[PDB]
Amino acid sequence: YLSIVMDPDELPLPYDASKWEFPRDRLKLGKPLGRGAFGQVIEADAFGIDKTATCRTVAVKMLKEGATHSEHRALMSELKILIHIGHHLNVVNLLGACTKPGGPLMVIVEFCKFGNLSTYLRSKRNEFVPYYKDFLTLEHLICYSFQVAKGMEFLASRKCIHRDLAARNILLSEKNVVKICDFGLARDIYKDPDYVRKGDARLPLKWMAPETIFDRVYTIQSDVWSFGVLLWEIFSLGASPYPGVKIDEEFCRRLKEGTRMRAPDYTTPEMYQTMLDCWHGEPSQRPTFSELVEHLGNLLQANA
Numbered sequence: 535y536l537s538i539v540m541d542p543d544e545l546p547l548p549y550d551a552s553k554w555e556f557p558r559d560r561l562k563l564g565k566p567l568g569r570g571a572f573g574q575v576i577e578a579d580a581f582g583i584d585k586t587a588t589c590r591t592v593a594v595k596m597l598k599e600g601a602t603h604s605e606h607r608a609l610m611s612e613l614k615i616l617i618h619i620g621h622h623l624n625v626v627n628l629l630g631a632c633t634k635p636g637g638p639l640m641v642i643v644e645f646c647k648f649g650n651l652s653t654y655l656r657s658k659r660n661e662f663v664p665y666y667k668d669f670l671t672l673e674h675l676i677c678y679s680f681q682v683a684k685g686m687e688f689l690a691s692r693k694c695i696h697r698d699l700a701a702r703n704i705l706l707s708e709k710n711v712v713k714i715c716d717f718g719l720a721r722d723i724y725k726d727p728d729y730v731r732k733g734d735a736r737l738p739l740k741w742m743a744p745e746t747i748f749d750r751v752y753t754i755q756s757d758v759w760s761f762g763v764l765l766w767e768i769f770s771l772g773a774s775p776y777p778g779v780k781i782d783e784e785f786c787r788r789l790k791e792g793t794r795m796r797a798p799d800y801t802t803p804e805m806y807q808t809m810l811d812c813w814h815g816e817p818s819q820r821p822t823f824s825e826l827v828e829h830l831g832n833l834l835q836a837n838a
């Protein structure tokens with residue numbers, strides 16, 4: 535289960551072990567940060583992984599009991615696409631991997647100390663003011679929004695899409711930097727109500743563009759729709775989308791016909807209009823991530 539993938543619309547991966555391979559004995563595994571059926575992300579201390587002679591807290595994805603060879607192959611392709619994507623401030627950064635025989639495949643990325651953005655924002659409801667040290671403000675929210683737009687613009691430039699863009703897949707680290715990730719195998723989607731059963735699949739319906747729901751099309755522009763939902767999540771401080779609405783056939787029907795969420799509690803007028811732009815019924819009429827980067831950039835400096 536991987537949602538970050540090469541864009542099929544853009545098609546038509548080696549492994550440089552001398553670069554990426556990290557000795558398992560320089561890694562000390564710690565507590566779980568997330569668990570799915572067949573995979574998990576665990577906190578760990580990596581000695582010298584990115585700076586000579588320095589201990590570094592990292593996150594490591596690996597398989598668990600119940601996984602089979604096909605999950606193993608899938609994790610390997612996750613490693614390979616992370617290598618292809620390369621470095622950007624706003625995408626969780628690959629630091630190394632353990633791929634030698636005799637032990638588990640392990641994919642090592644930077645640790646983001648505040649966890650996923652949805653949970654985090656939902657914990658700051660009592661510590662927010664629009665304009666008190668450690669209180670969140672409108673500036674933070676706009677800034678997080680701007681950052682994710684940049685990461686997504688970057689992913690687009692690497693010819694990838696994110697099939698599961700949502701606040702639960704945004705991480706907050708120090709210095710108010712947010713990073714796009716995908717828990718993937720390390721999330722239990724059969725147990726997480728954000729994923730709704732449909733066919734043999736469990737899908738993030740509330741984040742999905744109508745053409746994705748009805749036609750099963752995944753494009754970068756369907757990602758823009760999800761980004762609109764993510765914006766709504768940010769400016770609701772971590773609320774669940776479409777509050778108190780049964781996600782069924784009629785939901786999808788009303789969505790295709792043009793029903794949208796009302797403005798969240800902490801939004802500005804400009805931001806809500808931006809959400810609405812992202813939720814344009816016509817994919818080609820939605821803004822691009824580049825246009826969003828520019829626009830959120832202006833909203834940011836305008837705000838301060």
Ligand SMILES: CNC(=O)c1ccccc1Sc1ccc2c(/C=C/c3ccccn3)n[nH]c2c1
Nearest residue numbers: 567593594595641644645646647648649715716
């Ligand atoms: C596309 N692949 C990945 O995103 C990925 C690859 C390897 C390992 C993990 C991930 S996803 C991920 C999930 C959680 C994390 C964290 C920390 C989360 C946290 C922090 C505090 C409390 C609870 N959870 N840091 N970095 C992470 C990366």
